Amino acid sequence: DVVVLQDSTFEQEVLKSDTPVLVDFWAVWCGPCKAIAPVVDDLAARYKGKLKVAKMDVDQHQGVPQQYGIRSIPTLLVFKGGRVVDTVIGADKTRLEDSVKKAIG
């Protein structure tokens, strides 16, 4: 259910998506990322028709995280029509749910 992104595939997968997209910026060393990851998976399953869920290992792919000003992780971006709907900084479960809802609404 969760798409693995690369710098080369980000435009196509995320920016040109027809549905809203949740992008989880994460790394293998990031403990709070593991706290938010099951919520991300759960949203992927819960909104399977209506939401694309994707993740980006900021150590594997540094170009795009840098263009979006991703300073710390976890950071999660909700996209729609190529634009950023919200930026969720940290494992903020509530804010993540709410921002997804706004996008889909």
Q: Render 1-33 in DSSP notation, one character per residue.
A: -EEEP-GGGHIIIIIT-SS-EEEEEE-TT-HHH
Q: Are 64 and 10 in contact (CB under 8 A)?
A: yes
**Residue-range domains of the chain with CATH:** 1-105 (3.40.30.10)
Handedness of CA 9, 43, 33, 102 (dihedral sign): positive
Q: In whole angstroms, give the CA distance from residue 17 to residue 30.
A: 27
Q: How many other C-beta atoms lie within 10 A of the C-beta of residue 52?
A: 20
Catalytic-residue membership of 43: no
* Region of residue 93 (phi > 0: left; psi between -120 and 50: alpha; otherwise: beta): alpha
The phi, psi pair for 2, rounded to 5°, reads: -105, 120
Catalytic choice (22, 30, 39, 58): 30
Within 13 Å of residue 17, how many CA atoms lie on the same side as its CB?
A: 26
Half-sphere exposure of residue 56, counting CA atoms within 13 Å on the CB side?
27
CB neighbour list of residue 104: distance below 8 Å, 6 or more residues apart: 20, 47, 50, 51
33, 36, 43, 73: the active-site residue: 33
Sign of the torsion angle spanned by Cα atoms 40, 44, 47, 51: positive
Mapping DSSP to helix (H, G, I), strand (E, B) and coil, where does residue 57 land?
A: strand
Q: How far apart are CA 105 and CA 90, in angstroms?
A: 23
Question: For the chain, how far is it from start to end, CA to CA, in angstroms?
Answer: 21
Q: Does 52 participate in catalysis according to the annotation? A: no
